[PDB]
């Protein structure tokens, strides 16, 4: 809180962190795609698609 | 300056056409027929090719064995081929063995036995041919290319025909085919090399005078094809070389754009890594392909028929991870026929073609084939002076205008055989038929 209740210090820190956190989120979103790229997307049948790919 | 092609007719309407060369001692005489597989329907598809086998299986006079002996005794050979629109039967011999060869050809065409026993025997031979074309990859690719480009139309059918027809072709339908199609107004007797025209006309009057004329004689090389943009993929991971053909609808023999299409074809040209000079060719695609090892070979083609054609390229490659680049760079070179070609490329291609069209005819069989092809597609032999004038008439504006209506943003027929995993789907190939920057 930066004090003994929710107040101005809390609001100003939440602003700074609320601005930052979406950038952190974008990095993790990118990481999960790079991790996925080793297997590729799964598909609704659950089988390999290595036999039949589309760009 | 080559000797003049002499041309005469008989009463039935058989054309005789000859070009003498007093420097050779052999002669090619034969019969070019304006008829082929395309004249069959779906039920008797395969008949024309079936007949070609039986033509050498014995006549009313000479049996199969006598026929063999007669040709052996002549000294030369006989040869035949059936295509979609043309059938040819010719005999290469010595100068003075020409009357024998004309007599044998006249016999096998008019008076062939087509004996049920022989039909039944060849029916197995031809059945085995169905499982051995499989090896001739270029032919496999081009037959699939015709089948898809002219989907469910007569030009799309194969020459061999389906297995089903081979088992049901009778001597009746064979006889009917050759009676309807092998008529005098569709036939040309051709002689090249050591032949006298006047001698050949006499031999024609002796042997081919009792040929039927058709009821309605149209001119030689008289034909509606509706091209289908489409693809056949015959993936085979165990083959090391990919074979790919790409084509658009091209030009007929008598198109006004026939020479423009040949010049455009020569701007892309051919390439083969095995030939020493090919790394130094002027063609842009040649340079791209050779520098980057994209292909073992490519061969541009512009195939014509009476009422349509196919214009495109045939590629072979072991570079299986860069097939995409190969196709991409090839189609971007086609784009440049629409956007970029100038007098530089056009005049270079014209120079190369002015010679090429004459160079091709370097023996009696090539000369006979040229007289026969031109007489059965155009109705006349076109003199080299006329050909030189039609080529000279091709400008860069003509090439650009032709490519803009024939290639640019058009559907293609595409066939891939072999390890073609890297060949992208139809849309990505067809998207390279235009350039977003233009
Ligand atoms: C900002 C949030 C996210 C974004 C932009 C995002 C984006 C994507 C994209 C574009 C793909 C590939 C296409 C698709 O399958 O839809 C994907 C696949 C995947 N995502 Fe997400 N994602 C997000 C959040 C999450 C979350 C919260 C999870 C898991 C709890 C998740 C797990 C996965 C998995 C397992 C796949 C692979 C699924 C497959 O193709 O079989 N993602 N994501």
Swiss-Prot record, chain A:
Binding site for a ubiquinone: 37
TM spans (from-to): 14-34
Binding site for heme b b562: 18
Positions with a binding annotation for heme b b566: 32
Subcellular location: Mitochondrion inner membrane
Domain of life: Eukaryota
Extra facts: Heme 1 (or BL or b562) is low-potential and absorbs at about 562 nm, and heme 2 (or BH or b566) is high-potential and absorbs at about 566 nm.
Family stated for the protein in its record: Belongs to the cytochrome b family.
Function description: Component of the ubiquinol-cytochrome c reductase complex (complex III or cytochrome b-c1 complex) that is part of the mitochondrial respiratory chain. The b-c1 complex mediates electron transfer from ubiquinol to cytochrome c. Contributes to the generation of a proton gradient across the mitochondrial membrane that is then used for ATP synthesis.
Summary of subunit composition and partner proteins: Fungal cytochrome b-c1 complex contains 10 subunits; 3 respiratory subunits, 2 core proteins and 5 low-molecular weight proteins. Cytochrome b-c1 complex is a homodimer.
Protein name per its UniProtKB record: Cytochrome b
Gene name of the record: COB
């Amino acid at each position: 809180w930066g004090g003994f209740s929710v107040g101005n210090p809390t609001l100003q820190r939440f602003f700074a962190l609320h601005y930052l956190m979406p950038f952190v989120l974008a990095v993790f979103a990118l990481l999960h795609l790079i991790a996925l790229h080793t297997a590729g997307s799964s598909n609704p049948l659950g089988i390999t698609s290595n036999v039949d790919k589309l760009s | 300056v080559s000797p003049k092609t002499r041309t005469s007719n008989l009463k039935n309407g058989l054309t005789i056409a000859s070009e003498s060369n007093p420097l050779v001692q052999t002669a090619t005489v034969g019969v070019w027929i304006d008829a082929g597989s395309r004249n069959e329907n779906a039920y008797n598809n395969g008949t024309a090719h079936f007949f070609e086998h039986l033509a050498f299986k014995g006549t009313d006079k000479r049996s199969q064995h006598q026929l063999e002996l007669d040709i052996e005794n002549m000294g030369g050979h006989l040869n035949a081929y059936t295509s979609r629109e043309s059938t040819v039967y010719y005999a290469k011999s010595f100068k003075d063995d020409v009357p024998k060869s004309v007599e044998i050809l006249a016999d096998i065409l008019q008076h062939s036995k087509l004996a049920e026993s022989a039909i039944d025997r060849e029916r197995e031979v031809i059945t085995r041919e169905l499982e051995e074309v499989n090896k001739q990859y270029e032919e496999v690719v081009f037959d699939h290319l015709h089948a898809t480009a002219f989907m469910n139309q007569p030009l799309g059918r194969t020459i061999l025909g389906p297995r089903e027809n081979i088992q049901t072709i009778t001597n009746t339908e064979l006889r009917k085919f050759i009676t309807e199609n092998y008529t005098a107004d569709r036939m040309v007797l051709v002689g090249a090399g050591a032949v006298d025209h006047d001698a050949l006309v006499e031999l024609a009057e002796k042997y081919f005078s009792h040929l039927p004329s058709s009821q309605s004689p149209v001119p030689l090389g008289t034909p509606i094809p509706n091209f289908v943009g489409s693809e056949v993929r015959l993936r085979d991971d165990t083959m090391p070389v990919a074979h790919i053909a790409i084509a658009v609808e091209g030009v007929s023999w008598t198109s006004e754009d026939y020479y423009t299409a040949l010049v455009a074809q020569a701007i892309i040209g051919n390439y083969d890594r095995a030939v020493g000079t090919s790394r130094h060719q002027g063609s842009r695609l040649s340079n791209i392909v050779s520098e980057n090892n994209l292909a073992n070979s490519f061969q541009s083609f512009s195939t014509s028929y009476s009422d349509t054609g196919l214009w495109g390229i045939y590629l072979t490659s072991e570079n299986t991870t860069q097939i995409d680049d190969l196709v991409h760079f090839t189609l971007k070179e086609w784009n440049r026929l629409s956007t970029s070609v100038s007098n530089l490329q056009v005049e270079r291609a014209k120079s190369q073609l002015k010679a090429g069209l004459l160079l091709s005819l370097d023996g009696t069989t090539y000369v006979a084939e040229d007289i026969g092809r031109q007489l059965t597609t155009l109705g006349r032999r076109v003199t080299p002076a006329e050909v030189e004038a039609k080529l000279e008439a091709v400008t860069e504006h003509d090439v650009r205008a032709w490519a803009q209506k024939t290639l640019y943003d058009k559907d293609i027929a595409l066939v891939g055989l072999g390890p073609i995993e890297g060949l992208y789907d139809y849309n990505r190939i067809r998207n390279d038929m235009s350039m977003m920057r233009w």
